[PDB]
């Protein structure tokens, strides 16, 4: 028995139940910002404002700027990120999420600007293929812990094929201090920085930027953003 675990196969007893329990968990969550953020709705603006600053460097600076035609919000829920981060920056946004009721609520939550959400894909990321040469930005936030290592590596590889020229993938998510930790309540994992780095490398992706989110509640996991292509 090792000092700690470092991959999902060490903490997930039954992959089918890992996914089915997670789907059941999200079906029971209110379709609200505080539901998306597990009781942390009060820090949504802190999150979004840092994400905007992080992303704007790729859209506004450099000789090979990331485009603003189309973004994909992965694990989008009701569209908290689509509303305040993506729709103001991209002409069109697509959303993908496993929970249909969140995509339904999105149509109300997003309001008039939600008319620029094109596709509402109801699908688990582990079964989702983003269209080749389709997105300038693929935003993956607070959902990677719901995929096994093999599914996450393969999903990221499919995302890479989906990027337009100069496009990027952004992962923004919880990072454990060490190892891989199972949350048996929502049926998710939290991985350390080295594990995530290994998975990113295995998908064929290169790291463009890495940033720890400042100003978050003291008691929560650290949150990191990775820009990849």
């Amino acid at each position: 028995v090792p000092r700690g675990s470092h991959m999902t196969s060490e903490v997930i007893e039954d992959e089918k139940q890992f996914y089915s329990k997670a789907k059941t968990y999200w079906k029971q969550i209110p379709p609200t910002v505080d539901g998306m953020l597990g009781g942390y709705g009060h820090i949504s603006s802190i999150d979004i404002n840092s994400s905007r600053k992080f992303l704007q460097r790729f859209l506004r600076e450099g000789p090979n700027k990331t485009g603003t035609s189309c973004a994909l919000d992965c694990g989008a829920g009701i569209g908290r990120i689509t509303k305040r981060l993506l729709l103001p920056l991209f002409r069109e946004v697509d959303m993908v999420d496993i929970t249909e009721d969140f995509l339904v609520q999105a149509k109300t939550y997003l309001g008039e600007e939600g008319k620029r959400v094109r596709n509402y894909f109801c699908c688990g990321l582990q079964d989702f293929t983003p269209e080749p040469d389709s997105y300038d930005v693929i935003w993956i936030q607070w959902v990677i812990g719901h995929l096994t290592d093999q599914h996450l590596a393969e999903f990221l590889r499919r995302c890479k094929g989906s990027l337009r020229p100069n496009g990027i993938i952004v992962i923004k998510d919880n990072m454990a201090q060490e190892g891989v930790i199972l949350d048996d309540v929502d049926s998710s994992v939290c991985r350390d920085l080295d594990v995530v780095r290994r998975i990113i490398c295995s998908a064929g992706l290169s790291l463009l930027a890495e940033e720890r989110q400042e100003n978050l509640p003291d008691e929560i996991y650290h949150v990191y953003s990775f820009a990849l292509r």
Partner: peptide, 6 residues
Amino acid sequence: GPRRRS
């Protein structure tokens, strides 16, 4: 989303 550390 955000989660209290284990």
